[PDB]
Symmetry: C2
Subunit: 174 residues, 2 copies
């Protein structure tokens, strides 16, 4: 509601900006044509006095100046871009490393907890053995182990499914 | 009929098929869990009959804890894996970018050599004009060449800024 309100504004200001930039670049273009005319006059007057090869060399020097200027600027820009992207990658990597630290601590905690649960499980086995038939006990063992196993399998299938769904989405989208 | 389109359709159809089958197997597992769980319930009924309430509660709690911790460890190992596979990528991307940077650096050194050569050649040209042209003409030439360079620079700048503004505009044309 109010987001389109701001967005329209931004888009507008930005269009105005781009139009201005266009204008300025036009001005510069004109100045370029003028200066080129100057160079043309120069080359004519020099073409009068000197040998053809010398005039040619003059011309190629004049072109070369512009060329190497544009080249240097281009490489400068590209370099800058690359630097920027690298820095970005670095920040991202830092974030990921932190996330990893966290995951790890949580894992250690989870392990501690699992050990605890294992001992408790010893206790439970004790309780069942003291209160239920051998059959019922073997049945419990089977039950608990199968519970774990089934959870595992289920998560595996959940993952495979999820991922494959991602793949599909990406393909179909193309 | 275009091959690639065809192969793609075949591909996504395969994906659909296997997704269906996977859903199937998943349902199977689901029902299994149902059964095994009924088993649990029966066990607990028995024990509950033969034992004090707190002990039955401990049993229940342990039975729940096994499952919960299984799940937790599983999801943690998963998240961990994904994280490491993200790192492995942020590695290769970085390496590639760095190679590109190398190339750009070599190109820059080269281009600098070039600028130097063009410079000395420019000295010679200056000599030529000196010999054949009036001082006014030579001054005019120095001006012209300087202004050429400056104008190229400014035009470059404007071109870049325009490009950027356009990037922003277009990217905002979506949201």
């Amino acid at each position: 509601n109010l987001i389109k309100q701001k967005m329209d504004e931004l888009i507008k200001h930005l269009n105005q900006k781009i139009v201005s930039l266009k204008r300025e670049q036009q001005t510069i273009s004109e100045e370029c044509s003028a200066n080129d005319r100057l160079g043309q006059d120069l080359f004519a007057k020099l073409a009068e006095k000197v040998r053809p090869s010398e005039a040619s060399k003059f011309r190629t020097h004049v072109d070369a100046v512009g060329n190497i200027t544009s080249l240097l600027l281009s490489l400068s820009e590209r370099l800058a871009q690359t630097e920027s992207s690298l820095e970005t990658r670095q920040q991202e990597r830092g974030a990921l490393e932190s996330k990893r630290d966290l995951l790890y601590e949580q894992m250690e905690e989870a392990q501690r907890l699992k050990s605890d649960i294992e001992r408790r499980g010893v206790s439970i086995a004790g309780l069942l053995a003291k209160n239920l038939s051998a059959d019922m006990c073997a049945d419990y063992d089977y039950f608990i182990n199968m519970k774990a196993k089934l959870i595992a399998d289920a998560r595996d299938l959940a993952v495979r499914i999820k991922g494959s769904e991602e793949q599909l989405s990406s393909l179909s989208d193309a």
